[model samples]
Target chain A: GSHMKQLEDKVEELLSKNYHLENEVARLKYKRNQEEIETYYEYTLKIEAINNEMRKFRHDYVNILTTLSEYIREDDMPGLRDYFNKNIVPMKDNLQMNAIKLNGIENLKVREIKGLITAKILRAQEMNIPISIEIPDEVSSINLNMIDLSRSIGIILDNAIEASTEIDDPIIRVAFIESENSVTFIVMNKCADDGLSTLKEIADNADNVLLDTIIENGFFIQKVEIINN
Target chain B: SHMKQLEDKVEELLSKNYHLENEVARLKYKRNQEEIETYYEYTLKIEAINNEMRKFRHDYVNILTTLSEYIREDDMPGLRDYFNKNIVPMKDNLQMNAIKLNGIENLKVREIKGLITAKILRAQEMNIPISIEIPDEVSSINLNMIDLSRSIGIILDNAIEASTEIDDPIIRVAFIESENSVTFIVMNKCADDIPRIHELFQRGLGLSTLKEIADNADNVLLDTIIENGFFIQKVEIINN
Candidate 1:
């Protein structure tokens, strides 16, 4: 009887722990989803600013070009040059700076991936980790479905930045390779100790089968090579 | 025999507990997957809108040069014609649509935001006059997210469908909150021959379904009214 009660208590404790773990997992997922969505919101603000700028440019240019017609008709070359120098020249620079500031991101038209990477990379920057992003080809979208890829990429990048930040000199190098068939993501980050990829825990805990099948089909792949382990 | 029975009972409890972990994992995966999908769908809609903005920007230089064509030639008649036919309508459109959606920024919940954005886009696509109101910030709703979103989809679907039958169609969508509850109100112009609210609930396909969903969440309340020649669906989720 005593043995049965102790074993029952043990099972209850395990079950209770499992219940709390489930809640913890769910809360974290909700929090993460909220963060990514908000990131997209901020991304939209930047793009909307461009639209605003373009509209303003249209108004300014329309006015100036109309006035320039008058200047040209009156044979006012000096006046035309002065107006052009003051207005159009700076306008050109304004448009260029606005576009160029959000450089590598403008190339990624896939909104989810763009926001996720933007959030993660920006956070990495804040963490004092030197990171470089290179996208030789324009990616309209990723080949794999977004949700799965979002989770995988979020996990990998978050884990990398965490692992990378511990060392004295932290560096993260990432590249997006778009071949004819699929989008390849390559990430090399500094690791203090060789724990291999920070993926075993991710697989053991959540969506293991889908990730496994996805990797087996070569749809999703990640290599956590310790550049200088 | 006593110890043996005890062992069997222990094994039964442990096996049942094992099932809990598997079920929880499955549930977590599905819920997260569904949530992310909702967000992905929303962003895709947003990207489509953003791409349209880029097209507007692309036309910036296009229009610049086009207007310049007439200006360069000093063709006053051409400028007037183009301004009336092309430029006026374009600028008017930018003014009409671009700034109207500013309130959606305050809709903090992605699922609700996406649902409303998608439905609003549909109404616009249908050429319906619509107003979207989120008077203040709303980050969370104290009810089942999926059901609440589903109810809204149903509400707006009904609204959009009913509005399409008339020559003059208008939809009003408002998400307002109080100390105790968050309320979603959707009003659409309805035909004069519309049935009573109770009759509609009993006879209609989706309103009944809407009521069924509301019933599942004890805190969620659904009310439909026809007054002032408009069909209104009011869904309120009370905080408990």
Candidate 2:
């Protein structure tokens, strides 16, 4: 009877953990799906915007070319110059892809890492969190396993983006710096006033002993540092 | 004390399951609504593009006629003027339709069109050709959009997977409305011998989302029939 009671207690504890794990997994799945859908929708809209602009410019170009022929036939150099300045110049400016810069993307060696980072950046864009990334034109692969390293970077970036959501002027800066013998990932973002507690909450959510040990220190501006062997 | 604790734990587990199911349902409902809305918007965009194409065609005819006149009169200046002004501008306005699906627009309901279009597009991306046919009589059906769409998506996905295993993969999706029920039918070429109907319906057998819809009400019936290397899944939902 005593043995049975102990077994029952253990089973109940296991069940409780299972329940929490299931709930966490479901929540994460929903969040991931929403982010993916938002990213897809945003890309579709961007393509549409670009296509519309191209269509408009083509239409105007035909008109300009035809009108220019007329102007040339009439020996009106002044009219051609005015139309080129007023119409063509403005259309070129309008066709510009705007200030959205995707810099240093070609340097990423790991295909999965490149994809994961690109997706996270798109997710951040959807969240309206401005992020600037700087990587070398030829980036070396990390010492750690690609999948684990990508997951770690994704989680850290997610945390940085989440913290930035509360602030008015939020900027997330991510860079990969290579030193003499090692590489370091630098992710910096503005944090809330009670930053230490926020960092503690993140460490707790990580549920990993190694991550907890690495992030034990108090974070003011929330700069996450990772040193690769 | 042990008995009471065990009872409490079981109750808690049941409550958690209940909450998770409800949360999933809400998520599914919201996702369905968004998809249907997106499909509706896509149709409007396609129509707008078509209208622009028509206007461009009319302008093209007028330009062609004028160019003919210039050529007939040997007016080099007029020909040059028409080519640059009218023909050039019309080239920019010239648009090719992005949509090339047959019988998709015939689906009057946005939800059905949305779900079917998504499935067909996915299949085409996998290099599998899919044909969709929705008769005018099958205009609308009275059923939960989320459940129906989920069921349709699942069947189409299964059909796509099955069709891909063969050399010539072809999938045909059709909708038929009876007096009091509407049926979604998906037919695809099977690479192997016909599978058992019960086995396909079993959990972890075919990834059937129809079970979830079937669980909701007794009015929903799923029938799977295969003959001569053709696999078909028919889901009939009775109007309440």
Candidate 3:
């Protein structure tokens, strides 16, 4: 009887431990699923937002230029100069600084890498990182796939999100700039190593899947490495 | 005899109870005269990123083209020959296939779409086919240029999005003139699900944009349709 009881107790303990392990695994799976779902929805939302913004800009551009023309026609030097400084000059600067903004970069066929970064930031928020995202009023829009773009944005952001876990005060800053032919994205974070060392090689290596996929399918022409604190 | 009568009465009562269930269903039809005008406002941040992406791509291609041209022309016969054989064919193929589609109806949707089409052709190197059919002469459909562009953009975007999902996707756009009105039809070789159809139509941002264009241009958007497998959107520019 005593032997039987001991065996029963041992079996009970094993079963309890097994149950605990399963519960832990289930919890982890849920967290991962939630993170993924959250990221995906954000990506979809972001893509649509971009398309809409592009349309608005296109529609308004003529009016804007026309309004500027009216000021020019009046020969109001101060007015024209103010308009030039406020709108025209800024636009020209955007064109020069980031060609993508002025003329659009990358083939506007795929979702683009920026969307992936966006997803990653959302994932980071779930991971309890205080993330501040300042996407510009006129981030600009391109003809691209919503999915790939979202994925690229998610991936870049994921790197930053992962890095933030180690720092005392983790700060990731995403800045958008446009030139006539290029668009410049500056993802900055206060970190030990400023940016990914392998990025250039990744950018160059034709075989690298992530880099190649981005370069071939995504809309990013040239991306800046992380500018460290 | 009395017991039989009581049983019949009970049966009648049960039948009436069953009928009452049907009666309750009818009450639901009473119009809920309360017009619940639910205004849902949704804002998206994808525009900023998309714009930036476009900018990046344009520059990248231009730079590459410049670089390749320079390398090909410079004092390097081997490299020049290599490009002549490989990249040159690819470039020509792109123009022959993709750009050819746009050339047929070279309507510049404010140069953006035109530029994009040119870029897509350049990238695809003649693979992934796109076909567009537009009239050489479009009626002055009393539409503002900006609004017209927006409508064209929305439909073209839908066509592009659907095409990218498929292995071999084909898109056709045409502006047809009837006796009474000028009609625009955009058809894609996609027979996607109806539920997915609803999702596309309800893209609030996209719809509002289309509406904004319509508002400015005096154009009426016929309902977007996908009866059977083909996706189609029709807009009419009527004669006032």
- Best model per lDDT: 1
- Compose the digit string of candidate 1's lDDT tens values, residues B57-113: 555545534545555565656755665576555545544653565657778875466
- Between candidates 1 and 3, the one scoring higher on DockQ is 1
Model 2 clashing residue pairs (backbone): A62-B88, A66-B84, A66-B85
Kindly list the per-residue Cα lDDT of model 2 for residues A138-228, writing each as its tens digit.
4657665443455567777877888778777777777776666555566777656652344444434432312422332333223333344
Candidate 1 C-alpha lDDT tens digits along A1-229: 7887887676677667667766766675454455445544543433333333343434444455567566656656566556656665554445744544454646676666665677576568657898777776667765443554556676767766877766888877677766554456676676575432445554444432223211322123344211110
* Model 2 score (lDDT): 0.59
* Candidate 1 chain B: 10-residue stretch with minimal lDDT: B56-65
Clashes of each: 0, 3, 55
lDDT of each: 0.63, 0.59, 0.47
Q: What DockQ results for candidate 2?
A: 0.03
Alpha-carbon DockQ of candidate 3: 0.03
What does the interface RMSD come to for each candidate?
6.3, 10.2, 22.2
Q: For candidate 1, list the clashing residue pairs, or say none.
A: none
lDDT per residue for candidate 2 within B1-240, as digits (tens), equals 867776676677667666776766777677667766656654564455345444543443344444446545555667666666756544333321113354676677644554465455456535586777777556676665545655776788788767765788889888887788888888898775555788456324435446767766778888889878788888887886
Q: In terms of TM-score, how similar is model 3 to the real structure?
A: 0.31
- Each candidate's DockQ score against the native complex? 0.07, 0.03, 0.03
